[PDB]
Design a protein around this ligand. Structure first.
Ligand code: CLA
Ligand code: CLA
Ligand code: CLA
Ligand code: CLA
Ligand SMILES: C=Cc1c(C)c2cc3nc(c4c5[nH]c(cc6nc(cc1[nH]2)C(C)=C6CC)c(C)c5C(=O)[C@@H]4C(=O)OC)[C@@H](CCC(=O)OC/C=C(\C)CCC[C@H](C)CCC[C@H](C)CCCC(C)C)[C@@H]3C
Ligand SMILES: CC(C)=CCC/C(C)=C/CC/C(C)=C/CC/C(C)=C/CC/C(C)=C/CC/C(C)=C/CC/C(C)=C/CC/C(C)=C/CC/C(C)=C/CC1=CC(=O)C(C)=C(C)C1=O
Ligand SMILES: CCCCCCCCCCCCCCCCCC(=O)OC[C@H](CO[C@@H]1O[C@H](CO)[C@H](O)[C@H](O)[C@H]1O)OC(=O)CCCCCCCCCCCCCCCCC
Ligand SMILES: CCCCCCCCCCCCCCCC(=O)OC[C@H](COP(=O)(O)OC[C@@H](O)CO)OC(=O)CCCCCCCCCCCCCCC
Ligand SMILES: CCCCCCCCCCCCCCCC(=O)OC[C@H](COP(=O)(O)OC[C@@H](O)CO)OC(=O)CCCCCCCCCCCCCCC
Ligand SMILES: CC1=C(/C=C/C(C)=C/C=C/C(C)=C/C=C/C=C(C)/C=C/C=C(C)/C=C/C2=C(C)CCCC2(C)C)C(C)(C)CCC1
Ligand SMILES: CC1=C(/C=C/C(C)=C/C=C/C(C)=C/C=C/C=C(C)/C=C/C=C(C)/C=C/C2=C(C)CCCC2(C)C)C(C)(C)CCC1
Ligand SMILES: [Fe+2]
Lengths: 51, 25, 45, 31, 35, 78, 38, 34, 35, 351, 32, 73, 50, 152, 31, 309
């Protein structure tokens, strides 16, 4: 029981981390900025300052 | 004594590297 | 009493150890050194 | 008396944190 | 009198002098060879 | 004058000829150093049947600085 | 009263430095008050 | 490119030779009935 | 205390429903990229 | 007048030696090398030899060696016996009398490794200075290393010097260092010292800064590469920085409340936190060297003694320290010749 | 920014902050 | 500036001590007397080692007893 | 020590530093003397504490 | 606009202000010595010299005065537990007062040297710029220190 | 009123640095 | 477009707020505010809590004779175990205080708040065009807190084994945990220590090199220093690979130490080398592991009460 519990808790934690990673990447890629900021139209530069 | 060891290190570094710290020739 | 009980495994392990060590020591040193030639070969100090 | 001193120190730290968050000097140096 | 510990300490001084001289001679010989 | 690359030595024949015959010598030297029991004598490590002496049945204690040599000689059983 | 000294600069402390100093002193007081009072 | 017995040679060997010797010693230690 | 339990349940349900309907209100379409 | 510049005189042996030392090869020797490479080398060698052949049977009553059947975690180079209070344990000294085997048995290998390692640390710091001077850079790495060298000096030389001898210095091993840690917890209440608290804050904050900076830099990168992998979209000869400082500043100003706006200040903060933490830890251990420990909280002790029906976590920690000391002293300090009967050993059910 | 002046003050050193450095005196042999 | 912004104040003690702070920057050619400095540094290191070992009981001499008991002479 | 000091002082009044030492230790700057003095008081502090 | 930690570097060139600053530091340390002497003398309890010595009462600067020959006091007592009849000029109180007077004199000298910072003594004859002949200054100071050590 | 000297130490340590920093900030802000 | 719901959504998701809220925000903010309010109130004026469930309360509030170092919020009574213990399920408010409910309240709300904080990090990164992997970096401290506060009590079987919300409480938790499981010899805690120390090392050294390089070159000039200082030429020549390594070292270390804590919760253990060296005749030769075991045994004997009235 100890072996099963430890192993599967570790696997579940790592797979939750994997969900975080892949969900973030998928949403970013769908948005169109999975490779980085454009450097020509930074969205931050198009916002009011002193957030 | 330990604090002054650190002080010695810092001041010796700022002596030997005077030109670099001052950004001159 | 303490004394080794294996007779001929020493040579068999030593041959493999030397053969592996030669390559494993030459290769990473090459990989690290080539950039050292590149850096100290015209833009140094 | 000690409890009052501890509470005052903690409240002061929280107030400093709040002021730093909200009343900071604007970062126009790079923005 | 020259106690054994004093003799050993003097021998240590001699040995350390020998080591420093060895390092100095090594650097001197190689530097002269290369320049 | 340029400190030859490692690739050149890797393909060299003299380097391999020397090392394939010299490295096993060192490995066998270490094996014999441990096997023949010279390590125990050189470094003073007691053998598994010498930890407890006939007269002593507990861990040794030096309890002496300027005569520590004789103390260790007696405690080790030599 | 002899001649103005050319080596006369002025210390300057922006707001971030003020906040850092206040936080440092207050946090050190928090850490060490229990020990000072025993 | 030709000369040997350089600083690199000494640096490599000083840490290589004892390493092989100690690996042999430890491998011998492994086979002790104790 | 039934009143406290009911109040806490109401608050939690309100917040959770707000959250769920927030992420259902076409979240992926509100980003600074155009795609 | 007869003026002069720099290097307008005849050459000397020093010039040839300096030219040879400061060449461009795989390993930069420099002058500091003459102090660093030998010393450090021996240190490592010592430790390895120490962890492979020699034994601590006659010093601690322990068996710590691969030849005696120990792991990598349990092997160590144990400190000399408490009888050799502060003797430097030269091979030629009055203790070893020139005998190498008895020198190893007496524990002199620990002193060998410690002293040669201290001088190796000095040589490494001088090497950092020399490299920085050779490449015309400010030597902040020298200060960043002034931190660990201070920690080492404190723990491994000032603590044993203030105590009864080298016996209580850390022994070079994994389980040995764990024993050192538990010994401090039991005997000094080192966790309750404000200076270890400052050091813990410094170290954990340094880890936090490292992680946050890496994540922020890797997640505000500029898209200057067609491929889906962003590592090849960069070369060392770039003009502009590879990450958007404005975006990172806004992100960490809207998530956390405050954010950096200056690369120099950010990286100097990263340099500053660990150095300050470790220096505070060093000061605390210097205090401990004289048994000036933060242990009492006298008011709590008085209140606990007055009425048994008053228990705080501090009192439980004090009881745990009592247990640690009582159950460890029997074997951790063999020179005391302590025989605690089971009756007097502290126990929880006796409270 | 160079020319730290005879007083050693540099308006913006490599750190970007004002600082003051000692004025090293050059060496001669005899002098007048 | 002219003469570093006009000459400084003159005092009798200033004129008396002026010679001691006039030849600033004067140096000898070559290495001068650095070898003597090295010799004296080595001798001083030996002296420090001797006293350290005497005070560390790593060098026992006949005359010295190295304990509080020497306070009774 | 006293006597030696005197003698040493005399030497340092009558013998100028070598140019190589003058530039190596930057004897023209007032900060090198500060570093050396900090080191000296550092050493004295350990000696007296011990 | 110097930072708070680079402030005193404003004295890194002109020797007169450096002398004034060093005089102020010397005055502060001497005043501390005198003040601690007075405080400990006020707190010291000399009745019992066997079971209540200096080191048991937390005295810090008193033992350093006693180590060199200061024993008596103007209160009539002695560090020995006996009683002093002619304490003389050199007692604990006398030493403390002397240190305080020296602190004040050094303070006045410091303010003077701060006011009259520009002195011809600090300008070398050639190049007419501020400079200190550090090797010769060190020679003079070492000569004086050795003389005082030998005298002591 | 317990540990009067401790209270005095804490008050001074909180006041003197705080007053110094505030005075410096006010002095520089006039620029 | 002008609907009230649309305006509320726009305000919640607006990037013009001084502090971004988002939907993770609307969830967390009440949670963390409740947690901090209850934590402050209990830390200042909470009555003693019966941690062990043997009618021997432990005081942890400032009013009840404590200071900042020794104060804490005591975990729930061992009698409750893992049972859900809100205010409305206790017989009376005094009993709720006595058993230790505020700890459960604070820990639950805090865990939810930190999870939603991890969510809103990603949410703002998405609304700003940033890449989304800062939540992955933050998952390490979140994982460690989750372990210490929820997974250890789950495996052990009671909330009384969770870390007290205090300083001396934290030290007591560590000492007991070492006594019971021998954490120091577990490889995962070793990896965590390596991660923390290496993160400190890399932060200090990266700061040193960058500060040195930054003049009035950021990677091509400083790399000459590091390439020869400790060898390793062309080890990290990219400003991107280096920063990814910085991000990866401590995060992985803390992930491993959190997993180790959870496994110890389900109680495998750290290593155990007790009596691992024996001479001929079978006598036991002590190693440093044996001394560590003696310290652990002393700690354990002090931790257990057994005799409880
Ligand atoms: C069925 C599940 C699944 C699937 C199909 C994928 C598929 C993919 N992933 Mg994802 N991923 C998953 C689970 C999954 N992953 C989980 C659970 C995690 C959390 C760790 C990740 C984390 C992750 C990252 C961070 C990245 C990917 C990437 C990728 C892509 C390339 C594969 C790769 O990494 O190269 C082959 C993989 C390797 C060479 C790595 C082998 C060495 C591993 C790390 C150690 C070996 C296992 C070890 C013994 C166990 C230690 C833990 C133990 C205690 C259990 C591919 C689309 C990469 C990509 O390009 O994204 C688009 C990328 O950057 N994934
Ligand atoms: C002989 C001793 C000596 C002397 C003359 C100097 C002189 C100097 N140092 Mg050095 N230093 C010393 C010892 C000394 N230092 C030691 C022991 C250390 C180790 C901690 C340092 C570390 C150090 C650093 C890191 C730096 C200097 C700098 C400076 C210059 C500006 C002074 C300053 O910091 O602003 C004035 C500072 C303040 C007004 C702040 C004071 C607040 C302190 C921290 C707390 C209060 C102290 C307390 C009242 C008195 C303590 C007494 C104790 C010493 C016994 C100046 C040339 C700076 C410089 O020019 O470099 C660019 C600089 O960056 N020093
Ligand atoms: C630069 C490299 C270096 C450095 C810094 C050290 C430093 C040290 N070693 Mg290591 N060692 C080295 C190289 C080095 N060693 C090498 C290459 C070897 C192999 C041969 C060793 C082998 C070794 C062993 C086996 C031992 C040490 C020990 C020591 C320590 C004692 C030092 C001592 O008393 O020596 C002597 C120091 C001097 C002689 C100082 C120089 C003084 C000169 C000679 C003055 C001469 C002037 C004049 C003629 C003297 C007049 C007096 C009288 C003759 C009239 C010290 C930490 C010992 C130790 O403490 O271990 C625990 C020890 O046991 N070392
Ligand atoms: C959250 C938990 C935590 C954390 C983060 C820390 C953090 C720290 N503790 Mg610990 N501690 C804790 C809990 C904790 N403590 C508890 C609960 C106890 C029980 C009381 C202790 C007991 C304790 C003791 C007893 C000591 C510390 C010390 C320290 C500091 C270590 C500094 C350092 O790197 O030294 C290690 C680094 C060095 C010694 C520098 C030497 C590095 C050399 C030059 C490298 C050698 C080259 C090498 C061969 C290269 C190989 C590399 C290879 C490994 C990859 C640091 C502030 C130590 C300290 O700093 O005190 C001053 C110390 O002595 N702590
Ligand atoms: C576990 C703690 C720890 C270790 C092991 C460590 C190790 C190292 N850091 C170095 C550097 C640094 N560390 C730095 C900051 C920090 N370093 C820290 C913590 C550590 N740093 C912390 C907390 C900080 C923040 C202040 C900086 C800023 C630097 C560097 O610049 C330098 C570097 O370039 O890193 C890449 C290297 C120094 C090489 C050396 O020893 O020179 C050669 C000298 C030698 C070998 C003599 C040492 C001999 C020792 C004392 C004797 C014992 C040796 C045995 C193997 C001991 C084994 C002990 C057992 C318990 C295993 C080395 C890789
Ligand atoms: C009733 C109540 C209130 C209860 C309270 C009870 C209680 C327990 C009180 C707490 C007591 C308390 C305060 C204890 C702590 C005391 C303590 C030990 C103090 C240590 C003090 C000290 C001097 C230590 C020395 C070491 C030291 C200096 C450590 C500093 C630690 C530190 C501040 C670390 C940094 C932390 C941090 C969160 C940094 C994040 C920075 C950040 C936002 C960067 C983001 C960022 C990254 C980029 O990469 C870029 C590019 C940009 C742009 C950018 O922005
Ligand atoms: C920052 C500095 C970085 C550079 C440092 C690099 C390392 C330098 C080389 C190591 C030097 C080691 C010196 C050993 C001194 C020694 O063994 O002392 C051992 C002896 C004392 O010896 C003791 O004497 C006692 C009184 O009779 C008892 O008899 C003890 O039994 C006996 O051991 O002391 C000395 O000889 C040295 C005194 C002066 C130096 C003191 C150093 C700091 C002291 C700190 C005190 C606690 C705080
Ligand atoms: C000249 C040295 C050449 C290298 C010798 C071999 C080195 C390897 C030694 C391995 C251990 C073997 C036992 C040797 C030890 C040994 O057998 O010593 C014995 C020797 C003489 O002692 P005796 O045996 O005569 O004493 C017997 C009785 O009379 C004792 O009371 O001691 C010495 O004279 C000093 C020797 C130093 C040898 C170490 C050399 C390094 C010295 C430190 C260098 C410092 C440099 C500082 C630079 C700043
Ligand atoms: C003998 C070999 C083994 C022991 C060596 C011990 C180190 C001695 C040499 C240190 C040189 C440091 C160079 C730094 C790097 C460097 O290049 O520095 C350069 C600096 C001045 O160099 P120059 O101005 O002549 O250079 C002109 C051009 O090359 C500049 O680009 O040299 C010195 O300061 C010499 C100081 C000697 C002071 C020590 C005298 C001897 C003390 C006693 C020694 C006892 C043992 C013998
Ligand atoms: C004697 C002596 C000396 C010297 C010494 C020396 C110098 C030494 C050296 C030494 C050395 C130099 C050693 C080395 C060693 C090494 C080793 C011992 C290694 C090991 C390794 C291992 C064990 C590995 C493992 C692994 C890997 C990494 C791969 C695969 C995986 C594994 C994990 C398996 C003198 C005379 C001065 C003095 C006295 C003492
Ligand atoms: C806290 C502490 C510290 C420090 C401290 C200090 C640094 C102090 C100082 C103090 C001081 C520094 C003091 C001083 C005092 C002074 C005085 C008290 C003076 C007086 C004077 C007078 C009284 C005068 C008078 C006069 C004059 C002016 C001259 C003329 C005549 C007459 C007489 C009028 C530390 C951090 C280490 C830590 C521990 C503790
Ligand atoms: Fe960076």
């Amino acid at each position: 029981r100890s072996w099963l519990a430890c192993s599967h808790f570790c696997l579940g934690f790592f797979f939750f981390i994997g969900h975080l990673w892949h969900a973030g990447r998928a949403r970013a890629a769908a948005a169109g900025f999975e490779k980085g900021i454009d450097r020509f139209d930074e969205p931050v530069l198009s916002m009011r300052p002193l957030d | 004594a330990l604090l002054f060891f650190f002080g010695h290190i810092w001041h010796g570094a700022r002596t030997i590297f005077r030109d670099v710290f001052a950004g001159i020739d | 009493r303490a004394s080794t009980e294996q007779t001929t495994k020493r040579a068999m392990l030593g041959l493999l150890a030397g053969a592996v060590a030669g390559a494993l020591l030459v290769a990473p040193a090459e990989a690290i050194r080539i950039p050292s030639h590149e850096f100290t070969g015209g833009m140094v100090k | 008396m000690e409890a009052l001193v501890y509470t005052f120190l903690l409240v002061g730290t929280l107030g400093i944190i709040f002021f730093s968050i909200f009343f900071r000097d604007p970062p126009r140096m790079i923005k | 009198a020259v106690t054994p510990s004093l003799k050993n300490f003097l021998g240590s001084l001699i040995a350390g002098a020998t080591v420093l001289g060895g390092i100095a001679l090594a650097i001197t010989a190689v530097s002269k060879f290369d320049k | 004058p340029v400190e030859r690359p490692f690739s050149d030595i890797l393909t060299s024949i003299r380097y391999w000829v020397i090392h394939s015959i010299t490295v096993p010598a060192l490995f066998i030297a270490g094996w014999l150093f441990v096997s023949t029991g010279l390590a125990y004598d050189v470094f003073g490590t007691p053998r598994p049947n010498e930890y407890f002496t006939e007269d002593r049945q507990e861990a040794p204690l030096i309890t002496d600085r300027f005569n520590a040599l004789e103390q260790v000689k007696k405690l080790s059983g030599n | 009263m002899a001649r103005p000294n050319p080596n006369k600069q002025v210390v300057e402390l922006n707001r971030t430095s003020l906040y850092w100093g206040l936080l440092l002193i207050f946090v050190l007081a928090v850490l060490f008050s229990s020990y000072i009072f025993n | 490119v030709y000369p040997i017995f350089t600083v690199r040679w000494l640096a490599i060997h000083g840490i290589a030779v004892p390493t092989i010797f100690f690996l042999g010693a430890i491998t011998a230690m492994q086979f002790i009935q104790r | 205390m039934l009143t406290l339990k009911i109040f806490v349940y109401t608050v939690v349900t309100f917040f959770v429903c707000l959250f769920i309907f927030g992420f259902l209100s076409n979240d992926p379409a509100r980003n600074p990229g155009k795609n | 007048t007869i003026a002069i510049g720099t290097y307008q005189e005849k050459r000397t042996w020093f010039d040839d030696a300096d030219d040879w030392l400061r060449q461009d090869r795989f390993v930069f020797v420099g002058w500091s090398g003459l102090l660093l490479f030998p010393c450090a080398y021996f240190a490592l060698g010592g430790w390895l030899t120490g962890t492979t052949f020699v034994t601590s049977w006659y010093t601690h009553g322990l068996a710590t060696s691969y030849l005696e059947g120990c792991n990598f975690l349990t092997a160590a180079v144990s400190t000399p016996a408490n009888s050799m209070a502060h003797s430097l344990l030269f091979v030629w000294g009055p203790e070893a009398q020139g005998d190498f085997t008895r020198w190893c048995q007496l524990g002199g290998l620990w002193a060998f490794v410690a002293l040669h390692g201290a001088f190796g640390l000095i040589g490494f710091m001088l090497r950092q200075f020399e490299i920085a001077r050779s490449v015309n850079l400010r030597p902040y790495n020298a200060i960043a290393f002034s931190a660990p060298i201070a920690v080492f000096v404190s723990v491994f030389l000032i603590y044993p010097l203030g105590q009864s001898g080298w016996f209580f210095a850390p022994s070079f091993g994994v389980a040995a260092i764990f024993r050192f840690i538990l010994f401090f917890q039991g005997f000094h209440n080192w966790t309750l010292n404000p200076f270890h608290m400052m050091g813990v804050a410094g170290v954990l904050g340094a880890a936090l800064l490292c992680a946050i900076h890496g994540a922020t830099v890797e997640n505000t990168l500029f898209e200057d590469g067609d491929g889906a992998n962003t590592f090849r979209a960069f070369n060392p000869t770039q003009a502009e920085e590879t990450y958007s400082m404005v975006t990172a500043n806004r992100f960490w100003s809207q998530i956390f409340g405050v954010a950096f706006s200056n690369k120099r200040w950010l990286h100097f903060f990263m340099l500053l936190v660990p150095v300050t933490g470790l220096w505070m830890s060093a000061i605390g251990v210097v205090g401990l060297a004289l048994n000036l420990r933060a242990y009492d909280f006298v008011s709590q002790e008085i209140r606990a003694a007055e009425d048994p029906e008053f228990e705080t976590f501090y009192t439980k920690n004090i009881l745990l320290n009592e247990g640690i000391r009582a159950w460890m002293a029997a074997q951790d300090q063999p020179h005391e010749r302590l025989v605690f009967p089971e009756e007097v050993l502290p126990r929880g059910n006796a409270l | 920014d160079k020319k730290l002046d005879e007083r050693g003050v540099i308006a913006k050193d490599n750190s970007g902050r004002q600082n003051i450095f000692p004025t090293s005196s050059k060496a001669y042999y005899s002098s007048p | 500036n002219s003469d570093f912004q006009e000459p400084g104040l003159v005092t009798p003690l200033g004129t008396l001590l002026r010679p001691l702070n006039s030849e600033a920057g004067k140096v000898l050619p070559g290495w001068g007397t650095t070898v003597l400095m090295a010799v004296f540094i080595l001798l001083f290191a030996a002296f420090l080692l001797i006293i350290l070992e005497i005070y560390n009981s790593s060098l026992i001499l006949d005359d010295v007893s190295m304990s509080w008991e020497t306070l009774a002479k | 020590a006293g006597i030696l000091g005197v003698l040493a002082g005399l030497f340092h009044l009558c013998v100028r530093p070598s140019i190589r030492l003058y530039f190596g230790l930057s004897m023209g700057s007032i900060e090198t003397v500060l570093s050396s003095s900090i080191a000296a008081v550092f050493w004295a502090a350990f000696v007296v504490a011990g | 606009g110097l930072p708070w930690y680079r402030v005193h570097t404003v004295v890194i060139n002109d020797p007169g202000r450096l002398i004034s600053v060093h005089l102020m530091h010397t005055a502060l340390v001497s005043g501390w010595a005198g003040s601690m002497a007075l405080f400990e003398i006020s707190v010291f309890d000399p009745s019992d010299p066997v079971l209540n010595p200096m080191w048991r009462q937390g005295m810090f600067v008193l033992p350093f005065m006693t180590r060199l020959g200061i024993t008596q006091s103007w209160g009539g007592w002695t560090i020995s537990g006996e009683t002093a009849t002619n304490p003389g000029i050199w007692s604990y109180e006398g030493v403390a007062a002397a240190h305080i007077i020296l602190s004040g004199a050094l303070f006045l000298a410091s303010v003077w040297h701060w006011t009259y910072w520009d002195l011809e003594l600090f300008r070398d004859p050639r190049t007419g710029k501020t400079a200190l002949d550090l090797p010769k200054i060190f020679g003079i100071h070492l000569f004086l220190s050795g003389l005082l050590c030998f005298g002591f | 009123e317990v540990n009067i000297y401790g209270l005095t130490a804490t008050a001074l340590f909180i006041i003197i640095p705080t007053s110094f920093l505030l005075i410096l900030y006010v002095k520089t802000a006039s620029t | 477009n002008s609907s009230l719901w649309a305006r509320f959504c726009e305000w919640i998701t607006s990037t013009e707020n001084r502090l971004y809220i988002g939907w993770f925000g609307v969830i967390m903010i009440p949670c963390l505010l409740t947690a901090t309010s209850v934590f402050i109130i209990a830390f200042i004026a909470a009555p003693p809590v019966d941690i062990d469930g043997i009618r021997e309360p432990v005081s942890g509030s400032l009013l009840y004779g404590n200071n900042i170092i020794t104060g804490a919020v005591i975990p729930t009574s061992n009698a409750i175990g893992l049972h859900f213990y809100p205010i409305w399920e206790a017989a009376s408010l005094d009993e709720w205080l006595y058993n230790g409910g505020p700890y459960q309240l604070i820990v639950c709300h805090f865990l939810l708040g930190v999870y939603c904080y991890m969510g809103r990090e990603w949410e703002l990164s998405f609304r700003l065009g940033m890449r989304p992997w800062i939540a992955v970096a933050y998952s390490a401290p979140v994982a460690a807190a989750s372990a210490v506060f929820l997974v250890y009590p789950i495996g052990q079987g009671s909330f009384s084994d969770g870390m007290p919300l205090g300083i001396s409480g934290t030290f007591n938790f560590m000492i007991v945990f070492q006594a019971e499981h021998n954490i120091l010899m577990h490889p995962f805690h070793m990896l965590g220590v390596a991660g923390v120390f290496g993160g400190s090392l890399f932060s200090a050294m990266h700061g040193s090199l960058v500060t040195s390089s930054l003049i009035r070159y950021n990677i091509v000039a400083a790399h000459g220093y590091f390439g020869r200082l400790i060898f390793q030429y062309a080890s990290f020549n990219n400003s991107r690979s280096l920063h990814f390594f910085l991000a990866a070292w401590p995060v992985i270390g803390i992930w491993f130490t959190a997993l180790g804590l959870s496994t110890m919760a389900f109680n495998l253990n750290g290593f155990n080398f007790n009596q691992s060296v024996v001479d001929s005749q079978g006598r036991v030769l002590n190693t440093w592991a044996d001394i560590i075991n003696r310290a652990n045994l002393g700690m354990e004997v002090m931790h257990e009460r057994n005799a409880h009235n």
